C-alpha cells in the first residue's frame, strides 16, 4: 500500500536487478514504467532516455515529448512532464553514458539537475533545463552550454536562433543558438558529412559523428 515514486525507492523496496519497473511520479492513481540501471556506479539510476537500435525515431513533436514515447524495454523517452514531476519534489543528479562504433565508452556527470525548478507552471516556463557542477567522465561538458534553455521542437521553437535549430538538427533538445549535445538527433550510424544533425556529443566525438548507444540517467541527490 506504499508506492515508490522514483527508482531509488525501488532500491529501498529491496530490488537491485536492472530492468523494467513501475514508479508513480504523478501519484498512486496511474504509474509509468521505466528502465532502471541498478548496476552502474552503485545503481539507483532512473533512466529517462534510451537509444541503441536506432529503430524508434526521436524526431517527434512537442506533444509526444511532453507526454513521453517509446518502450521501457528498448529505446524510449520518459516524457518532459514526468521528468518535471520528479525534479520538482526531489533533488537529483545526472549521468549520461555514451558509446561509439569503436567499442569505446564515455560519460559525464552533473551534480544538480532539474527541469524548470520551482516553476509554478512548467508550460509557461517552457521546461527549462538546469545543470550545475560538472564532474568529468570520458566525455566533455556539453550540457552546461544548454542550462537555462527551454525545450524546443519543430512544433515549438524556443531556441535563441532566428532559425528553428530543432528543425536544422533533426531532433529535440534545450537549444540555444544551437546545440553542443543533440542526443535526440537522427541515428545516422557512424560518421556523417552533414553538420550537427545526428546523435552528437560535441566534446567527445565532435559534430560529424553519430553515436551507437545513448542513455541519460537520474538518481536522488
Amino acid at each position, epitope marked *: 500500500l506504499q508506492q515508490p515514486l522514483d527508482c*531509488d525507492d525501488i*532500491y*529501498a*523496496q*529491496g*530490488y*537491485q*536487478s536492472d530492468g523494467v519497473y513501475l514508479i508513480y511520479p504523478s501519484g498512486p492513481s496511474v504509474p509509468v514504467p521505466v528502465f532502471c540501471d541498478m*548496476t552502474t*556506479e*552503485g545503481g*539507483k539510476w532512473t533512466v529517462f532516455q534510451k537509444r541503441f537500435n536506432g529503430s524508434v525515431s526521436f524526431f517527434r513533436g512537442w506533444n509526444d515529448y511532453k507526454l513521453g514515447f517509446g518502450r521501457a524495454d528498448g529505446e524510449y523517452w520518459l516524457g518532459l512532464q514526468n521528468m518535471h514531476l520528479l525534479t520538482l519534489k526531489q533533488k537529483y*543528479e545526472l549521468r549520461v553514458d555514451l558509446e561509439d562504433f569503436e567499442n569505446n565508452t564515455a560519460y559525464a556527470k552533473y551534480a544538480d539537475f532539474s527541469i524548470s525548478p520551482n516553476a509554478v507552471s512548467a508550460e509557461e516556463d517552457g521546461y527549462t533545463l538546469f545543470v550545475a557542477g560538472f564532474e568529468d567522465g570520458g566525455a566533455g561538458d556539453s550540457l552546461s552550454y544548454h542550462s537555462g534553455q527551454k525545450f524546443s521542437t519543430f512544433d515549438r521553437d524556443q531556441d535563441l536562433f532566428v532559425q528553428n535549430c530543432a528543425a536544422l538538427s533533426s531532433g529535440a533538445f534545450w537549444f540555444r543558438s544551437c546545440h553542443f549535445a543533440n542526443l535526440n538527433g537522427f541515428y545516422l550510424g557512424g560518421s556523417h558529412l552533414s553538420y550537427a544533425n545526428g546523435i552528437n556529443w560535441a566534446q567527445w566525438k565532435g559534430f560529424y559523428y553519430s553515436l551507437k548507444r545513448t542513455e541519460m540517467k537520474i*538518481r*536522488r*541527490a
Partner: antibody
C-alpha cells in the same frame, strides 16, 4: 539503539554445516540491506554476500555460491547465514553488517555486529 | 579481480604527528573507496566513504583523498584513540574486495 546481535561461537567438523544468526534492533529491519563479511585472523577481509529482508533477493560472492545460502525471519528481525560444506581454512570471525543508504553509491557498512568466531577442525 | 594492497604493512608514529596511509588498486576503481578503523577484538567502524567523505560523528582530523588507482588516508594530528588497524574496501564494483590491513602503533 541500533545494534546487531550475532550468535555465539560454534565448533564444527570438516564437511558439516554451520548456521549463524544475526538479530536486529533499533531500526526497521525491512528497510536496509544486510551484508555478510568474514575476517580471517591477520588476513584480508572477504565479503560473503548480501540479502534484503523485505524482498528476499540475494547476491553472493562468486566463489561462495552453492555453499552459502542466506535467509531472514521477518517476524523476529533476524538475519541468517549458513555455510553448507565447511573447510579447514574457513576458520574466521563472521560479521553481519548493515548497508546505509546515502543518495548514491552507498554499499558501505556503517553498523556492524560483534563477531561470531567460527572454528572448523577435526 | 580488483585486488587491494595497502601500504605500509606496519607504521609506527607518535601522538600529534601527521600520518598518511595508502590503499592501492589493481584495476581502475573510480572515485569510490571507504576506510575502516578496527580496534582489537572489536567490529570495524567506518570512517571515510566514497574516497573523501567522512561519516557523521568522525573527528575532523580524519581526511581522505585520491581517485582512480591510488588513494590516501591522512590524519592531521594523532591521538591515543587513533592507534588501531585501518582497512580499505573496494566499494566500486560488486565482487567487493578489502585491503590488506595497516597496523598503526605508537612509537617510544
Amino acid at each position: 539503539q541500533m545494534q546487531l546481535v550475532q550468535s555465539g561461537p560454534e565448533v564444527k567438523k570438516p564437511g558439516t554445516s554451520v548456521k549463524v544468526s544475526c538479530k536486529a534492533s533499533g531500526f526497521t529491519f525491512t528497510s536496509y540491506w544486510m551484508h555478510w563479511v568474514r575476517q580471517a585472523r591477520g588476513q584480508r577481509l572477504e565479503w560473503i554476500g548480501v540479502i534484503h529482508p523485505n524482498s528476499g533477493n540475494t547476491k553472493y560472492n562468486e566463489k561462495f555460491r552453492s555453499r552459502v545460502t542466506m535467509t531472514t525471519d521477518t517476524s523476529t528481525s533476524t538475519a541468517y547465514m549458513e555455510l553448507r560444506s565447511l573447510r579447514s581454512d574457513d576458520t574466521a570471525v563472521y560479521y553481519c553488517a548493515r548497508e546505509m543508504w546515502n543518495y548514491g553509491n552507498s554499499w558501505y557498512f556503517d553498523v556492524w555486529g560483534q563477531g561470531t568466531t567460527v572454528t572448523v577442525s577435526s | 579481480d580488483i585486488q587491494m594492497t595497502q601500504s605500509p604493512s606496519s607504521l609506527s608514529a607518535s601522538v600529534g604527528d601527521r600520518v598518511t596511509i595508502t590503499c592501492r588498486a589493481s584495476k581502475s576503481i573510480s572515485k569510490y573507496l571507504a576506510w575502516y578503523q578496527q580496534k582489537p577484538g572489536k567490529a570495524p567502524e567506518l570512517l571515510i566513504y566514497s574516497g573523501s567523505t567522512l561519516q557523521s560523528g568522525i573527528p575532523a582530523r580524519f581526511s581522505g583523498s585520491g581517485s582512480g588507482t591510488e588513494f590516501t588516508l591522512t590524519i592531521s594530528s594523532l591521538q591515543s584513540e587513533d592507534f588501531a588497524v585501518y582497512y580499505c574496501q573496494q566499494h566500486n564494483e560488486y565482487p567487493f574486495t578489502f585491503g590488506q590491513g595497516t597496523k598503526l602503533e605508537i612509537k617510544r
